[PDB]
Amino acid sequence: EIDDALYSRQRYVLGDTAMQKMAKSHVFLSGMGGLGLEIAKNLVLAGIKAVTIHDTEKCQAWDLGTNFFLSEDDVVNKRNRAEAVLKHIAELNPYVHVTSSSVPFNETTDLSFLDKYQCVVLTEMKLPLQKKINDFCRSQCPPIKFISADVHGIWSRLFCDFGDEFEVLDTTGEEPKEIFISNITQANPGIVTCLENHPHKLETGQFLTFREINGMTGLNGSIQQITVISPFSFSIGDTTELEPYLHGGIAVQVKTPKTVFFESLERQLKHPKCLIVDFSNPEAPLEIHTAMLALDQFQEKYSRKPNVGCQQDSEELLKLATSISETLEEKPDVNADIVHWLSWTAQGFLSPLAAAVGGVASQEVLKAVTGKFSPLCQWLYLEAADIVESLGKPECEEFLPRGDRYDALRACIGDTLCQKLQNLNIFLVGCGAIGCEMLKNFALLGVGTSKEKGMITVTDPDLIEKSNLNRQFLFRPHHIQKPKSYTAADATLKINSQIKIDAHLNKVCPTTETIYNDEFYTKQDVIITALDNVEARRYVDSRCLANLRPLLDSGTMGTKGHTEVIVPHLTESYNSHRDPPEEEIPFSTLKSFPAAIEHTIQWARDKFESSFSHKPSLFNKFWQTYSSAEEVLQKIQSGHSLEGCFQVIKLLSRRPRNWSQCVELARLKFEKYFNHKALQLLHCFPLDIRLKDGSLFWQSPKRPPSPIKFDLNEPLHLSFLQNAAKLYATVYCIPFAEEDLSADALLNILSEVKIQEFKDERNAIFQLEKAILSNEATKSDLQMAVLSFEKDDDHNGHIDFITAASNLRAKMYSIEPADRFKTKRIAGKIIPAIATTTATVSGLVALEMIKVTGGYPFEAYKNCFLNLAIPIVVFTETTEVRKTKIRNGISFTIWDRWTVHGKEDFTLLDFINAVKEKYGIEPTMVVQGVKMLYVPVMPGHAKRLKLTMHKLVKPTTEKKYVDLTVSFAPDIDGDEDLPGPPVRYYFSH
Amino acid sequence: SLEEKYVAVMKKLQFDTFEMVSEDEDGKLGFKVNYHYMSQVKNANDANSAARARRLAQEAVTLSTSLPLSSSSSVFVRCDEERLDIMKVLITGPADTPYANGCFEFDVYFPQDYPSSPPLVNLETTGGHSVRFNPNLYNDGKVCLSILNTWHGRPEEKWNPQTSSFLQVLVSVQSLILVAEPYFNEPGYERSRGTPSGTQSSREYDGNIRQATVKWAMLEQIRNPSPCFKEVIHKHFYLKRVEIMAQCEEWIADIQQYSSDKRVGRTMSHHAAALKRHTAQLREELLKLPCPE
Ligand SMILES: O=P(O)(O)O[C@H]1[C@H](OP(=O)(O)O)[C@@H](OP(=O)(O)O)[C@H](OP(=O)(O)O)[C@@H](OP(=O)(O)O)[C@H]1OP(=O)(O)O
Numbered sequence A: 001e002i003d004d005a006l007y008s009r010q011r012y013v014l015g016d017t018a019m020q021k022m023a024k025s026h027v028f029l030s031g032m033g034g035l036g037l038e039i040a041k042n043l044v045l046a047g048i049k050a051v052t053i054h055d056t057e058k059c060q061a062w063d064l065g066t067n068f069f070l071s072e073d074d075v076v077n078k079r080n081r082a083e084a085v086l087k088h089i090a091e092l093n094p095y096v097h098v099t100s101s102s103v104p105f106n107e108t109t110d111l112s113f114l115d116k117y118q119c120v121v122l123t124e125m126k127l128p129l130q131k132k133i134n135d136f137c138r139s140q141c142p143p144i145k146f147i148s149a150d151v152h153g154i155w156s157r158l159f160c161d162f163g164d165e166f167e168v169l170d171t172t173g174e175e176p177k178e179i180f181i182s183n184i185t186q187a188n189p190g191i192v193t194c195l196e197n198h199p200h201k202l203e204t205g206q207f208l209t210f211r212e213i214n215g216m217t218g219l220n221g222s223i224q225q226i227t228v229i230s231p232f233s234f235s236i237g238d239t240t241e242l243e244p245y246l247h248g249g250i251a252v253q254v255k256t257p258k259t260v261f262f263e264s265l266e267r268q269l270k271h272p273k274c275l276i277v278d279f280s281n282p283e284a285p286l287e288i289h290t291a292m293l294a295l296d297q298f299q300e301k302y303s304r305k306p307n308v309g310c311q312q313d314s315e316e317l318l319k320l321a322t323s324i325s326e327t328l329e330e331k332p333d334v335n336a337d338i339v340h341w342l343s344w345t346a347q348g349f350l351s352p353l354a355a356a357v358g359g360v361a362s363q364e365v366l367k368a369v370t371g372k373f374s375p376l377c378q379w380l381y382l383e384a385a386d387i388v389e390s391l392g393k394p395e396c397e398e399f400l401p402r403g404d405r406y407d408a409l410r411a412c413i414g415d416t417l418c419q420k421l422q423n424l425n426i427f428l429v430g431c432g433a434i435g436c437e438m439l440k441n442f443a444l445l446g447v448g449t450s451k452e453k454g455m456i457t458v459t460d461p462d463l464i465e466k467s468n469l470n471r472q473f474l475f476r477p478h479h480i481q482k483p484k485s486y487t488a489a490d491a492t493l494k495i496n497s498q499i500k501i502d503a504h505l506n507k508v509c510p511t512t513e514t515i516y517n518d519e520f521y522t523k524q525d526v527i528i529t530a531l532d533n534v535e536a537r538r539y540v541d542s543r544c545l546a547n548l549r550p551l552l553d554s555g556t557m558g559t560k561g562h563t564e565v566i567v568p569h570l571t572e573s574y575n576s577h578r579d580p581p582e583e584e585i586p587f588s589t590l591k592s593f594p595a596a597i598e599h600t601i602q603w604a605r606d607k608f609e610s611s612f613s614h615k616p617s618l619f620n621k622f623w624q625t626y627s628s629a630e631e632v633l634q635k636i637q638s639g640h641s642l643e644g645c646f647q648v649i650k651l652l653s654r655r656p657r658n659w660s661q662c663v664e665l666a667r668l669k670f671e672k673y674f675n676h677k678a679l680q681l682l683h684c685f686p687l688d689i690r691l692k693d694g695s696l697f698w699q700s701p702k703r704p705p706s707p708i709k710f711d712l713n714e715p716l717h718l719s720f721l722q723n724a725a726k727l728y729a730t731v732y733c734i735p736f737a738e739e740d741l742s743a744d745a746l747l748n749i750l751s752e753v754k755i756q757e758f759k760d761e762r763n764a765i766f767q768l769e770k771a772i773l774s775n776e777a778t779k780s781d782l783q784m785a786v787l788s789f790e791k792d793d794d795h796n797g798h799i800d801f802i803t804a805a806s807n808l809r810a811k812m813y814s815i816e817p818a819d820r821f822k823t824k825r826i827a828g829k830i831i832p833a834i835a836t837t838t839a840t841v842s843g844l845v846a847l848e849m850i851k852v853t854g855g856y857p858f859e860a861y862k863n864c865f866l867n868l869a870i871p872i873v874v875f876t877e878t879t880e881v882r883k884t885k886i887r888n889g890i891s892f893t894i895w896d897r898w899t900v901h902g903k904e905d906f907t908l909l910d911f912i913n914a915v916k917e918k919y920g921i922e923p924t925m926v927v928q929g930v931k932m933l934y935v936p937v938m939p940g941h942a943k944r945l946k947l948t949m950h951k952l953v954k955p956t957t958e959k960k961y962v963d964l965t966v967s968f969a970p971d972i973d974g975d976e977d978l979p980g981p982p983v984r985y986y987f988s989h
Numbered sequence B: 001s002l003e004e005k006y007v008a009v010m011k012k013l014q015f016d017t018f019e020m021v022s023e024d025e026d027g028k029l030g031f032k033v034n035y036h037y038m039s040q041v042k043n044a045n046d047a048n049s050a051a052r053a054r055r056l057a058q059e060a061v062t063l064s065t066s067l068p069l070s071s072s073s074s075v076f077v078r079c080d081e082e083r084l085d086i087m088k089v090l091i092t093g094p095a096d097t098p099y100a101n102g103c104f105e106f107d108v109y110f111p112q113d114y115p116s117s118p119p120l121v122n123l124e125t126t127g128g129h130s131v132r133f134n135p136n137l138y139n140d141g142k143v144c145l146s147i148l149n150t151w152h153g154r155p156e157e158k159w160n161p162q163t164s165s166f167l168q169v170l171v172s173v174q175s176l177i178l179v180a181e182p183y184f185n186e187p188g189y190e191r192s193r194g195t196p197s198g199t200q201s202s203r204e205y206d207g208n209i210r211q212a213t214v215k216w217a218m219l220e221q222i223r224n225p226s227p228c229f230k231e232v233i234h235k236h237f238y239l240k241r242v243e244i245m246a247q248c249e250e251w252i253a254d255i256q257q258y259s260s261d262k263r264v265g266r267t268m269s270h271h272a273a274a275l276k277r278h279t280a281q282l283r284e285e286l287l288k289l290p291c292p293e
């Protein structure tokens, strides 16, 4: 069994089979540097059964700048690097049996001990020993998965080898999509006519299965390979011998295993199959591979990395690279700049790049033991050459170590950029997984650690949850129900004692703009968002636009992720995006004509809403508005209409008084939901009715219902009855016990209940007077408890009730049911997530932050979109700002604002004339927010021109200025009003 | 001459401004009249795009210029004095339909992303959610139309941020929802239009809709008029009071013609009795209606 309260989000990504394969898997990892630590952290968060970390070198003062778990005590005691982190690593996940090893590694070492493990990861190890290990691992039966990852300065390298033949059980991990069929042609070959609209979006060679096809009863349950003909047709095999086709049809895609091939490490070095990440330089990965191979040969021949700024070392490395390149099969050209920068930053180490590579490698490791996605084939060369390219030709003395924790970062990006990093006032929004990883990156980079200046502000109103511990590594099981921001601030200080963090519990929204005023944003230097919803992102972006501050955005959905870089006066904003509107289920589909399990799940969710949240609130509001029920009766007797009075008075008459009445109510609701509805729908539309075209009204995607008679012996019926009874008892505030919920007790209760057979003012008055006579009008009767949808708590019965209702409705519509977890995901809109993608996007966002702080030109900034399922990583230039012209050659961008000043007798015509005089164009309408101030066509506004600003807007004394929006008449009649940049106006000077 | 006078008088009241929402000194939204989309208005951000304001202003220009107006049917729009996204619409039912001369009130709220998304329209004259005036007008007040993306239809029939306009929405409501035979608006019964059983079902539906219209669309609108349209409602009813009497008498006679049916006779009798009671109440109210200024 898998505890869902901790791995729910990961199960929504990997699935049960992948989880089971992850258990009973033993992973060996060598090299406890920064990259190795990141890989181990991601794996132990994933939930591997046992991980063995191996390292032979001892702790050094240089390791503090790359390791976020070491302390000064470890350096003082000269502890082994693997042992010094063993205790902290196990704290991330008690289910993982983490072990440490320190056996020496060399050519003469007995390497047969690796056969116990299933996946070996090598880091910071010599190349020839990697060759030997990879030769051994791939020759085992079964093969042992091999992954090599390294980071040298700002250049990385990743390699995979899952044997000569490896089989993946899921090519992409995307759920199959259901396709509707319109016509089948009895010919050789057959031709499929897809349903109207709804393109199938398939590819030739796939396997498709068909079901619910009238006529070809033999084609139901069969699997046929397709041949794409058009976006709405494809070709199937022989169907001539079959019976003709009437109507209907459903086709879904069938996943099939795929076999990929890998080559040995010693053979890949002579002609690698790299992965392209930047299409502007397709040949870049091969050149990077050549440079790093030259670096390894230099390390072999000199037993040391090249010194910083040494001319002879650079010349030797260039000569080695030139010699190596001509021996390659493709004969590439040695990139002088790449080799020069590799020599310059050979001894350095970059933290965000290490984190990104660690996330990718951990994802590959997860692929290795499960076969869940297509593995990387066969190299990956991430790099951050843009960091140093803008630096020109810095002096070697700037990169020299000084004897502090930041020696590694200084050796990469020079002393000046390191100092400018330590003096950043950066505002971080949200403290989710991405927020925690970004705080870790801040601690490793020393952001805002200077005494004089530097301040990190992190705000998040949520509390820590058990499911958050899987993805947010800064938290512990004893931190549950504590504030996220405070816990993160306390934990980050442990990593770096010099950090200066301010944690706020406030949300980020218009209601809280009084504290995050314009001065606060001006104080900040870069804003990073770790949000999870689009409205907050848009609000933050709009706030940043009004203050001209850089913004970095990121977001992950399962194995997918994206980053965006926004720079004032250079790029477009987040609000500039116009995504297409999403498809939404119409009212007819949801209410009466469902076709997929999602429709029934949504119907169950909003039925729960109406039954236990909306209507109880209406009841409470109505009865608190009119305290005296007798007064309500008097008003009704005098003909006074009231809002929802009939509905509420009907609710009062059916209010249960004890557990037995709650069980009866549950039975009645079950009958109403799943027996009466189908009968009345079939009565309205008989199954045999025809349309003008001759098609049956119940043609696809509509599905004919069928009544479900109650049966307590059915597990689903009993589950629904129990959950509905519990929810009704809780809502109506009556006690109950566990034995009252037993099957026998329920049988004894509803056995005597009669069931109604399927078929206002006076009734309301009768019910109200009967209730008054029966004394069912006390202050407890006029109140009803309201419930909230708590999906995360499994003992409240919300998810069980929703699942039972959705499954019953699906059974009514002959749709196959769904398991509890799928209903939990869909109804609660739980976004799938995992640690690897969040770590990777955090590393990339940190690199973008370095770029923004450096003040680099527009070409340096890169937006990234990655999907580890394929896997693909795409870097594209951020969209540049667009000049928008209006009239007379006047043009403006999204970052432009205009300013005007007025006085006491400043009238509306004065303001319009001032803007016309200043910018040469006449404003035609002025609006603050959603309040209109001048619209000539609207009646009652022509006389507004004389009105002064203070009378027109009636402003508050809090601010002397108000932000306005203007528009201008089109240069050609018949066109809409030209847009205009926002204008800020001051009531005085 | 009566129709010309009605057109001349009603034209001055087609478009106007009323104070629906006023802000107190603290800064909260106070509502002076009932509104269906109150919750979304309270949660509307102040980061409104200037494009939305421009589109609303142009729509206001179009509404003030070319709103439909005739004796058979008319449209009246009231906009908030300080918020372009608050609007109430009163539509008089076209003649020769069960909705004829009935005043129907609507609440329209424009979303923050407008015109990317169609404006939200909700019927208010639902009679306390007890009457389903049309297959596309559910008893809860939801309006189903293709142009509002709430109904199945072609892409050209769906909401278009560049070409679709609110005036088109109003015209579509008038020409598609308040039709002569609302029973056939349902996408399943329209294939039996003209058949005897379909005709009988349409007659029953028309009788029910007529009784509901007399009960709610005019009786409750004259007894408890909304503050926004009060003058419009009073003037309209005073001008057309004789036509209301003639229409009610004709409806009573027509529904009593089929009261002897062997299949729906009981429902016909019930609807006829309810219609007669509503007609008597309407007679009383119209007799008590003073002459508007
Ligand atoms: O409030 P809703 O979520 O729209 O559900 C209602 C509700 O049923 P429940 O109270 O059992 O959820 C109605 O019953 P009342 O509370 O108004 O008495 C019922 O009306 P009927 O009594 O006429 O069945 C109606 O069903 P319908 O619209 O088919 O008349 C049904 O609507 P849904 O279940 O489709 O939401």
Ligand SMILES: Nc1ncnc2c1ncn2[C@@H]1O[C@H](COP(=O)(O)OP(=O)(O)OP(=O)(O)O)[C@@H](O)[C@H]1O
Binding pocket: A009, A429, A430, A431, A432, A433, A459, A460, A461, A462, A467, A468, A484, A506, A507, A508, A509, A530, A531, A532, A533, A536, A830, A831, A833
């Ligand atoms: N307007 C906002 N202001 C501040 N923080 C916000 C705002 N909106 C969202 N957040 C925060 O953004 C974070 C997003 O992180 P994450 O994806 O882990 O969320 P979650 O709700 O904890 O996750 P899950 O949905 O898996 O339970 C949340 O912790 C939430 O508190």
